[PDB]
């Protein structure tokens, strides 16, 4: 029978709005005394209340900033700023779109075999290095690239130890010069300074040792486990590109240098950027390399010359997830591996809210790649660069706050972009503005006359 | 089954010496059994690492051992318009030790050598050298079959053929019953590897101090090859002897080449002229198949069987995953002139990174049931990773898959308990053969006595 608007005091227009969103107030003075002023709008119109005198706020959402989503500043959320106007206890919905525009973060660390066999391959590894740097920068602006070099454990019989001149110049007996032998040397931390990386890579030259198999597995292990030195980012794809033209030393080989201590899988680089345990600790086993690679989320790529591809392919099957490409004068083969790896990268859009007032509460409907509205959801998964998702958010205010103008932010996790929602609370009627301070009609110590009523 | 794990005897060397890296039983002329222990990082008398050897007399309480003396002075000889040089620093004397009759042979695989001639040289390189002692007389001799007087240039001009400069002679060693010393030299011929054989008698009778380069006419070295399968194969990383061709007048050699054929690994059975009689191939790359070899008849038919260790073997596990545990392969010798076949039994380690198969020791007949037995070492095995030695008894079918007994390391982490092993000798005269276990990391040796 009776409704909530009429049957709840309603001494004023304000109290009328406070009762419920469906309530409307009649200001028409020509309305009869019997009729209620606080009622449903339909009941008022039906009881001859003047259409202009009917007070009935309607909650609204207004886009303020609606810069379009980018293609190829960078805008990944649209719209960027909305104005919500709510009446007591009411709600209002609005739409938000999120696009993955920005390129994905990728770390490439590059291990250069600088043993003497690589004299004829030096150009090839310099080319591959600079091509990795340059071309991957075109694929992703969030590349960080760095490199290190290795020869072998600088100890007899791997190292030439006579005559004394041979230590500073391993090429002494050939009447030429090369660099002193070293185990593993970290040269350049993962950086986005591509031009510099290329310069340093072009400055590298070979050293020399005695035996064909080299100590690159020491370098792989240290490049994997030395977090701060190499500079792998937490939320980034990690690629470790390993170059060589020869077979490689493996765990238990070290006994030929009198080295029997098993590899501990710990970092031993530090200040001078050399692997300090090179001459005291054995080469790592495949099982231990596997464990650390997996544990540090690093993908190993063997970029090796054709004469040893089959060897490294075979090691690759024993270190799952590892891939092999061919080091040559042409960089295409190895580059395809990285591009393919980049092609497998997926991302998510997970909305989080910041500074949501006590009074307000939100609910979300996610519309993801499958184009199906999953209600109550605020995250989509499996996005690639270019994909867009959409959410519908509904904000509901509890009663009417005294604060009257608040704001919060809806932000996808890991995105700079955001939506600022400016909330205004509309609890007053328009006729209050016209108050008429002087009572006139009350005249019993009441004061003022608004919307056709006394106190 | 019956090694007593409670009543151990501990022998100890000096801190940092690697006492226990290698060991053997040694029996004197009176028949009294002592234990020779190698300690390759023992400080020489001038505070420089040279290595050393200790001869331990049998005592239940164990303790310290006397140091079996050897010349640790470097030598120089200016002769034939050349300068010959030996370098004993960091030579690792005692990296291997082996006893035969009343002789102890202790090798220094990283002893270096050089020859200078005007401005040229051979190159300072680890040729290795073995030291021979006859304790009850004091006689000393040496054997160093890889030393040369060829200059660096000539090797270059001959494409590094017959290059014995990096032999590390005595890296492994064994002596035949007749008294032929066979040395493994895995750096031989530019890291193919080689074997050097010479009668102990002839080593003694041809050696004089200060000569440095001399002839042992009866010696016999293996050959160089241009077969790439052999390159960097470390042929001679381990060595053993046995009877595999049915002719009791001939002795056969067993050689480990753990990185043979691009790290596939191999073990070879050879005649004494070094003709290959059989090759056993590795199962998995980098597994170090051939790290250890052992010869003993385990199924009671009088035909020697072969055991090979691959201590970095990775076992397949659920979800395409691999676990480094080590493996040992048993090859039973069939009747007649038939080849050794596929393995009769595979024993696989159960602890991650345990290096099961790092050492394999014939125990003789531990329980006197008629079948010979073995011990296998997993030097980083057991739940804690302190090390483990597992005993397997022989039977008609070969060996059992389940060990009869597990010996847990009594030493702390890093001891490498089991890295060296020897059995098949009754040290206390109770009529049951006993087991000695080295823990070089803890500079000690544990003796386990077999009981009824």
């Amino acid at each position: 029978g009776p409704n909530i608007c009429t049957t709840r005091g309603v001494s004023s227009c304000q109290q009328c709005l406070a009762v419920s969103p469906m309530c409307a107030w009649c200001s028409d003075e020509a309305l009869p005394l019997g009729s209620p002023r606080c009622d449903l709008k339909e009941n008022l119109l039906k009881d001859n209340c003047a259409p202009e005198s009917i007070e009935f706020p309607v909650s609204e959402a207004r886009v303020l900033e609606d810069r379009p989503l980018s293609d190829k500043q960078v805008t990944q959320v649209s719209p960027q700023r909305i104005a919500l106007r709510l009446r007591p206890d009411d709600s209002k919905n609005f739409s938000i779109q999120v696009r993955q525009v920005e390129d994905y973060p990728v770390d490439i660390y590059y291990l250069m075999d600088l043993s003497y066999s690589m004299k004829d391959d030096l150009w090839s590894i310099q080319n591959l290095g600079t091509k990795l740097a340059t071309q991957m920068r075109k694929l992703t602006s969030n590349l960080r690239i760095g490199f290190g070099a290795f020869v072998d454990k600088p100890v007899s019989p791997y190292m030439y130890i006579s005559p004394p001149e041979a230590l500073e110049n391993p090429c002494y007996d050939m009447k030429t010069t090369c660099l002193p032998m070293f185990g593993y040397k970290h040269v350049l931390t993962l950086t986005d300074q591509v031009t510099r990386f290329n310069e340093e890579v072009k400055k590298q030259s070979v050293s020399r040792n005695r035996d064909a198999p080299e100590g690159g597995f020491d370098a792989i292990m240290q490049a994997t486990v030395c977090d701060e030195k190499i500079g792998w980012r937490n939320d980034a794809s990690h690629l470790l590109v390993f170059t060589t033209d020869a077979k490689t030393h493996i765990a238990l080989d070290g006994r030929l240098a009198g080295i029997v201590q098993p590899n501990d899988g710990q970092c031993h680089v530090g200040s001078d950027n050399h692997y300090s345990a090179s001459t005291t600790m054995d080469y790592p086993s495949l099982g231990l390399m596997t464990e650390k690679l997996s544990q540090k989320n690093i993908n190993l790529i063997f970029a090796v010359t054709e004469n040893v591809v089959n060897l490294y392919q075979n090691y690759s099957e024993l270190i799952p997830g590892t891939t092999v490409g061919v080091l040559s004068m042409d960089s295409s083969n190895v580059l395809q591996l990285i591009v393919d790896a980049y092609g497998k990268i997926r991302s998510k859009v997970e909305l989080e809210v910041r500074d949501l007032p006590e009074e307000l509460s939100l609910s979300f409907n996610a519309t993801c790649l499958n184009n199906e509205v999953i209600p109550g959801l605020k995250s989509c998964m499996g996005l690639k660069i270019g994909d867009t998702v959409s959410f519908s958010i509904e904000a509901k205010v509890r009663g009417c706050p005294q604060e009257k103008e608040k704001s919060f932010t809806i932000k996808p996790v890991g995105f700079k972009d955001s939506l600022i929602v400016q909330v205004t609370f509309d609890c007053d009627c328009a006729c209050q503005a016209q108050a008429e301070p002087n009572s006139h009609r009350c005249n019993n110590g009441n004061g003022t006359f608004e919307c056709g009523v006394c106190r | 089954l019956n090694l007593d794990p409670v009543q151990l005897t501990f022998y100890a060397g000096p801190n940092g010496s690697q006492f226990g890296f290698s060991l053997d039983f040694h029996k004197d002329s009176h028949g009294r059994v002592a234990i020779v222990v190698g300690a390759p990082r023992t400080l020489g008398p001038s505070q420089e690492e040279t290595g050393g050897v200790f001869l331990c007399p049998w005592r239940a309480e164990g303790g310290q051992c006397p140091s079996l003396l050897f010349d640790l002075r470097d030598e120089t000889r200016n002769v034939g318009s050349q300068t010959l040089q030996t370098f004993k620093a960091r030579q690792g004397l005692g990296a291997s030790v082996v006893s035969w009759s009343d002789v102890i042979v202790a090798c220094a695989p990283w002893q270096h050598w050089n020859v200078l001639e005007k401005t040229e040289e051979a190159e300072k390189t680890p040729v290795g050298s073995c030291f021979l002692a006859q304790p009850e007389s004091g006689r000393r001799a040496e054997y160093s079959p890889c030393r040369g007087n060829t200059l660096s240039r000539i090797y270059v001009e001959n494409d590094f053929s017959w290059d014995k400069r990096y032999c590390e002679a005595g890296f492994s060693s064994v002596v035949t019953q007749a008294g032929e010393l066979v040395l493994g030299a895995p750096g031989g011929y530019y890291f193919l590897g080689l074997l050097a054989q010479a009668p102990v008698a002839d080593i003694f009778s041809s050696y004089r101090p200060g000569i440095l380069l001399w002839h042992v006419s009866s010696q016999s070295l293996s050959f160089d090859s241009s077969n790439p399968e052999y390159f960097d194969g470390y042929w001679g990383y381990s060595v053993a002897v046995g009877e595999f061709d049915g002719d009791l007048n001939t002795t056969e050699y067993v050689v480990g080449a753990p990185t043979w054929s691009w790290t596939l690994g191999a073990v070879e059975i050879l005649d004494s002229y070094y003709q290959r009689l059989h090759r056993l191939r590795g199962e998995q790359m980098a597994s170090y198949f051939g790290h250890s070899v052992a010869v003993t008849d385990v199924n009671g038919d009088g035909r020697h069987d072969l055991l090979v260790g691959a201590p970095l073997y990775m076992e397949s596990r659920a979800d395409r995953k691999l676990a480094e545990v080590g493996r040992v392969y048993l090859f039973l010798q069939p009747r007649g002139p038939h080849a050794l076949g596929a393995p009769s039994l595979l024993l696989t380690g159960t602890q991650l990174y345990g290096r099961f198969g790092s050492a394999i020791a014939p125990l003789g007949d531990l329980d006197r049931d008629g079948y010979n037995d073995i011990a296998v070492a997993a030097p980083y095995g057991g739940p804690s990773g302190r090390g483990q030695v597992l005993v397997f008894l022989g039977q008609s079918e070969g060996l059992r898959s389940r060990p009869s007994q597990v010996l847990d390391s009594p030493f702390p982490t890093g001891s490498a308990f089991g890295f060296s092993l020897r059995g098949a000798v009754d040290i206390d005269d109770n009529g049951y053969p006993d087991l000695i276990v080295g823990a070089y990391g803890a500079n000690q040796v544990a003796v386990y006595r077999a009981q009824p």
Binding site: Y116, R210, D211 | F160, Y190, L192, S226, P228, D232
Partner: peptide, 7 residues
Amino acid sequence: AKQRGDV
């Protein structure tokens, strides 16, 4: 083939 070193 002939040379087995770091060459």
